[PDB]
């Protein structure tokens, strides 16, 4: 069947999802993630959207403000809205899968609720496609592809010019923060390109 989602766990607990369509396949994935890593995922959702002070307090206000100032939520929603129904299924399947398991947990918290929700004094909320997308955006795009120190570099360069004068300040800048160095060991050999 098309309604059927079979979940097989191996000797390490690693889940394997058997499904006939995209929505059912990502629903299965979403479901096991909510089983295995709900507190982690929940904290990862608040970290990537800047909503930690709500449950954790005063100490995270600066963190929350810094996260919100580094993205444009509306630009992310517009990319979601432009997806094709097959692409959209991935994200919707996933959020739906998670929600299915959050509903049972929230229904039977005396045995299903992750101990840390009790510790931290809050409970899990339902997910939407925007939340799934933000997990990737916040931990892959901001943590590994958002690197610059240009303002700082300018500050440094300005200090080298008041020390060595204008032309000298610039040549020292090139010695400390060169653009390229032809002796750098490379992944692609020079014969290749």
């Amino acid at each position: 069947s098309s309604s059927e989602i079979k979940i097989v766990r191996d000797e390490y607990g690693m889940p394997h999802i058997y499904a006939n369509d995209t929505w059912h396949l990502f629903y299965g994935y979403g479901y096991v993630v909510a089983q295995d890593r709900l507190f982690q995922m929940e904290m990862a959702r608040r970290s990537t959207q800047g909503t930690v002070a709500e449950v954790l307090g005063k100490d995270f206000v600066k963190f929350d403000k810094d996260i919100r100032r580094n993205y444009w939520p509306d630009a992310i929603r517009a990319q979601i809205a432009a997806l094709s129904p097959e692409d959209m299924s991935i994200l919707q399947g996933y959020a739906d899968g998670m929600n299915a398991w959050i509903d049972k947990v929230n229904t039977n918290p005396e045995t299903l609720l992750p101990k840390q929700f009790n510790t931290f004094g809050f409970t899990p909320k339902r997910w939407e496609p925007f939340d799934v997308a933000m997990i990737f955006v916040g931990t892959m795009a901001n943590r590994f592809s958002d690197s610059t120190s240009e303002i700082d570099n300018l500050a440094l360069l300005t200090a080298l010019k008041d020390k060595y004068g204008v032309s000298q300040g610039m040549a020292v800048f090139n010695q400390l923060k060169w653009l390229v160095n032809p002796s750098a060991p490379t992944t692609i050999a020079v014969q290749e390109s």
Binding site: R9, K58, F136, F144, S147, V172, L179, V180, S183, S193
Partner: protein
């Protein structure tokens, strides 16, 4: 993050071998999540960070893929021109343009709420403003508006069956990331993926540009421009966040450089060493590189030359002889807390002293603090990520190369003194410092080993577990957060593919309300520490053969 890919011509008893060690820090519960997907055109196995829809590490029985951080320059800062009167406007192409703005309310558990505004221009969100210059800085990313497409390219690539299909997906991944390929036929490939700006002529990407119009990027460079290799003449592909290719410019980070001193050399040495490598040998490179001091190789010749005319009773000469006798591989003593040889401690003190006398001296305060680290960092919990050669150390290496270095020495870092005299002065400092703490008998120096901590707070510094959930490993290992190996066409099996991984502490982070920990909460922790690994299953018969449980759902959209 490191990777080594071995093709047909370098592989022994297989056609292709892929070993990946993504480095993201050590966390409890595991940074990555193990998952197999079978249906809707997908047939994959692997693990991926934060259980993203697409698997960063894994294979589909035909091809295998992996990644390492790219570090290309894909972000530039635009100095936006503001008017004192007419606020929330900026000058662009001779018109006063209005900024996008949004208000935000930060709700605070047990405190008052807080609201602020976020501003944005054509170039990007505003970082900071200088109302004295009447300048606002906007951070411009080449991948702005392709975030979602990058996620989907990472998902769709799992279905590729060849290089041709695989690169159609690589062309849509817009973040600066290295992608790797291997297949059942022994083919191997590499692509430095990402969206890079087509800059205006005379744009120096290390420094801000005016955002008034003339400095605006021309667009984005085509994918034909992205560094890539297929079936390289060497038989292998190695990367440890080094330069992709000759003359490729790195990130603008002051602290990031691609120079003659690079930790990828440590991988290359080992792969060129043996004409062919087996899977056990390819796996074994993790153990060696985990334990290798990264500075020994770079400065041993320099220290040797400087102490050559010194006497045997000279302590500065003794210290160099200790290092000469050493292979650079750190091993713990029986005590589980100290290293067998004092090499790293010596290089650490020497290097700190050397930096203070050379690079630090040439830079004005407080910029001098950026170049003073030796790269031996750590605290009690050990390093937060990988060990690397510090920026100051890469700059000092070029200086000690003298004229063999391609980098013009605008200021002589040795400030008119012969090299040997600065080296010997730092060696005197070293001896004075270390002998004071450990005594005069170098042979009984029991130096402190670095440790490994699986942190309860995620990389943002936000709790993702209870503090008590923190795990400790005695030996610091400069390796992936996870390690995975894929072997295509083993001669050793009937199986066309064999794959292994390790996801520590375990698959599950579940703790029941009563304090009852899941069965798979920490069953991979000891395996991690002793360089072990678990089989990854793809086919139904393997999965069936190894099943521990089954759950069937009947759901309709």
């Amino acid at each position: 993050s490191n990777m080594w890919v071995i093709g047909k011509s370098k592989a022994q008893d297989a056609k292709a071998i892929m070993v990946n060690g993504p480095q993201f820090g050590w966390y409890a519960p595991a940074y990555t999540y193990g998952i197999g997907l079978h249906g809707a055109g997908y047939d994959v196995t692997g693990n991926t960070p934060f259980a993203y829809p697409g698997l960063v590490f894994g294979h589909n029985g035909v091809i295998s893929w992996g990644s390492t951080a790219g570090f290309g320059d894909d972000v530039d800062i635009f100095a936006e021109r503001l008017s004192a009167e007419k606020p929330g406007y900026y000058l662009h192409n001779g018109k006063w343009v209005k900024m996008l703005s949004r208000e935000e309310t930060i709700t605070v558990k047990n405190g008052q709420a807080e609201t602020f505004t976020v501003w944005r221009t054509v170039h990007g969100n505003i970082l900071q403003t200088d109302q004295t210059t009447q300048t606002a800085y906007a951070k411009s990313r080449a991948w702005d508006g392709k975030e979602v497409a990058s996620l989907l390219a990472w998902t769709h690539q799992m279905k590729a069956k060849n290089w041709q299909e695989w690169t159609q997906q690589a062309a849509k991944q817009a973040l600066t990331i290295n992608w790797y390929y291997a297949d059942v036929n022994g083919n191997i490939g590499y692509v430095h993926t990402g969206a890079y700006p087509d800059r205006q002529s005379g744009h120096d990407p290390r420094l801000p540009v005016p955002g008034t119009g003339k400095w605006d990027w021309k667009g984005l460079l085509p994918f034909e421009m992205n560094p890539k290799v297929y079936n390289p003449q060497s038989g292998y592909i190695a990367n440890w966040n080094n330069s992709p290719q000759k003359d490729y410019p790195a990130s603008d980070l002051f602290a990031f450089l691609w120079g003659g001193a690079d930790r990828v050399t440590e991988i290359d040495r080992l792969l060129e060493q043996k004409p062919r490598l087996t899977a056990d040998q390819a796996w074994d490179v993790i153990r060696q590189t985990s334990r290798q001091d990264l500075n020994l190789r770079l400065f041993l010749p320099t220290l040797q030359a400087a102490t050559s005319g010194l006497t045997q009773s000279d302590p500065r000469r003794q210290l160099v002889e200790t290092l000469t006798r050493w292979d650079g591989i750190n091993l713990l003593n029986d005590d589980g807390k100290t290293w067998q040889q004092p090499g790293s401690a010596i290089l650490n003190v020497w290097l700190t002293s050397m930096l203070k006398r050379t690079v630090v001296a040439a830079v004005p305060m407080p910029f001098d603090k950026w170049y003073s680290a030796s790269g031996y960092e750590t605290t009690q919990d050990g390093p937060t990520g990988s060990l690397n050669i510090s920026v100051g150390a890469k700059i000092l290496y070029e200086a000690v190369q003298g004229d063999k270095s391609p980098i013009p020495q605008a200021v002589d870092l040795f400030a008119g003194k012969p090299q040997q005299e600065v080296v010997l002065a730092a060696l005197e400092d070293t001896w004075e410092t270390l002998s004071k703490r450990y005594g005069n008998n170098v042979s009984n120096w029991k130096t402190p080993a670095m440790a490994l901590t699986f942190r309860a707070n995620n990389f943002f510094g936000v709790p993702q577990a209870a503090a008590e959930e923190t795990r400790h490993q005695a030996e610091y290992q400069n390796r992936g957060t996870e390690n995975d190996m894929i072997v295509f066409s083993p001669t050793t099996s009937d199986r066309p593919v064999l794959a292994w991984d390790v996801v520590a502490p375990g698959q599950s982070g579940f703790i029941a309300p009563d304090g009852t920990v899941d069965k798979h909460y920490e069953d991979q922790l000891k395996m991690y520490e002793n360089f072990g690994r678990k089989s990854l299953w793809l086919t139904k018969q393997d999965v069936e053969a190894h099943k521990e449980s089954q759950e069937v759902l009947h759901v309709q959209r």
